[PDB]
């Protein structure tokens, strides 16, 4: 990810809302999926100011570079080789850390000695059980955070797993991502571009309307992107 662009994202338990992490700040967006009533609810503002529990930690100093909602008001956040499980309390505004900060390889042992050990580019919550897809360069992992294991017991290339990404900028990786409130729809970001994808746990599907520009799709981000 380059300066100013979306480096992390996750879906809120609050309907039709998502947190986007850029540099060392965040934006809370009502990304209005399936309509055009998008609006920025909060931000741009420092992670250290927004989520005070993160203020005097690595996440509050440097921001957050990968994430994904788990369940309820919880989400895993990453910065380089460290990660944390947080409660981002969207109603009470009373964020707390639940786990860590801990090295990725240690919260997720199966990642030790892989490309994810030193860091993760992007991730999103599967609709399926406790499954998660994570991306590092052109590689991706599918995990189960309840069993804390790799579902596909093998780390495979993105094109092997996302044919819709072949001959696109996403074939080689993503800046950030997040699962929509819209069942089985996923957003992938990369530079000033986004891909709205429809997935299905049976390997093969589609990009909806090709690769477009983030600010064309969400005019409310017009001069927030790049930051």
Residues forming contacts to Cl ion in the complex (CB under 5 A) are: 8-9, 67, 122-123, 176-177
**DSSP letter (8 states) at residue 35:** S
The breaks in the chain (C to N more than 2.5 Å) occur after: none
The vertex-101 CA angle with 95 and 102, nearest 5°, equals: 145
If contact means CB under 5 to 8 A according to the sort of partner, which of Cl ion, Ca ion, Na ion, none does residue 9 touch? Cl ion
Which of Na ion, Cl ion, Ca ion, none does residue 7 bind to, with CB < 5 to 8 Å depending on kind? Ca ion
Residues that bind Ca ion (CB under 5 A): 1, 7, 65-66, 121, 175
Q: Which one of 43, 50, 63, 101 is in contact with a copy of itself (CB under 8 A)?
A: 101
What sign does the dihedral 110-115-121-124 (CA atoms) show?
negative
200 binds a copy of itself (CB under 8 A): no
Per CB under 8 A, does 100 bind a copy of itself? Answer: yes
Half-sphere exposure of 41 (CA within 13 A, CB side): 16
Pick 58 or 115: Cβ nearer a copy of itself: 58
Residue 190 CB, shortest distance to a copy of itself, in Å, is 26
Distance of closest approach, residue 198 Cβ to a copy of itself, in angstroms: 38
Q: What is the CA radius of gyration of the chain?
A: 16
Q: Rounded distance, CA 5 to CA 37, Å?
A: 22
Which residues 38-67 are close enough to bind a copy of itself by CB under 8 A? 53, 56-58, 61-62
Contact of 25 with 19, CB cutoff 8 Å: no
Contact (Cβ atoms closer than 8 angstroms) between residue 150 and residue 112: no
Pairing of strands 82-87, 185-190: unpaired
Interacting partner of 11 out of Ca ion, Cl ion, Na ion, none (Cβ under 5 to 8 A depending on kind): Na ion
Min CB(167)–Na ion separation in Å: 25
Minimal distance, residue 184 CB to Na ion, in Å: 12
Asked if 2 and 224 count as a contact pair (C-beta separation under 8 A), the reply is no
**Interface with a copy of itself by CB under 8 A: which residues?**
53, 56-58, 61-62, 82, 97, 100-103
């Amino acid at each position: 990810t380059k300066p100013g662009y979306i480096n992390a994202a996750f879906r809120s338990s609050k309907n039709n809302e998502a947190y986007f992490f850029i540099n060392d700040k965040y934006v809370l967006l009502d990304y209005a999926p399936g309509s055009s009533r998008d609006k920025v609810l909060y931000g741009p503002t420092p992670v250290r100011d927004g989520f005070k529990s993160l203020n005097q930690t690595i996440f509050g100093s440097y921001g957050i570079d990968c994430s994904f909602d788990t369940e309820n008001n919880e989400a895993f956040i990453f910065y380089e080789n460290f990660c944390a499980l947080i409660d981002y309390a969207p109603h009470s505004k009373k964020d707390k850390i639940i786990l860590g900060p801990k090295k990725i390889a240690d919260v997720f042992p199966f990642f030790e000695g892989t490309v994810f050990e030193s860091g993760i580019d992007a991730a999103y919550r599967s609709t399926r059980g406790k499954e998660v897809y994570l991306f590092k360069g052109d590689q991706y992992a599918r995990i189960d955070y309840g069993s804390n294991s790799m579902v596909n017991k093998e780390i495979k290339s993105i094109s092997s797993g996302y044919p819709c990404f072949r001959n696109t900028i996403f074939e080689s990786g993503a800046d950030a991502a997040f699962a929509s409130h819209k069942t089985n729809e996923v957003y992938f970001f990369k530079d000033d571009h986004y891909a709205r994808v429809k997935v299905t746990p049976x390997x093969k599907l589609x990009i909806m309307d090709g690769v477009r520009e983030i600010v064309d799709y969400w005019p409310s981000l017009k001069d927030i992107v790049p930051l």
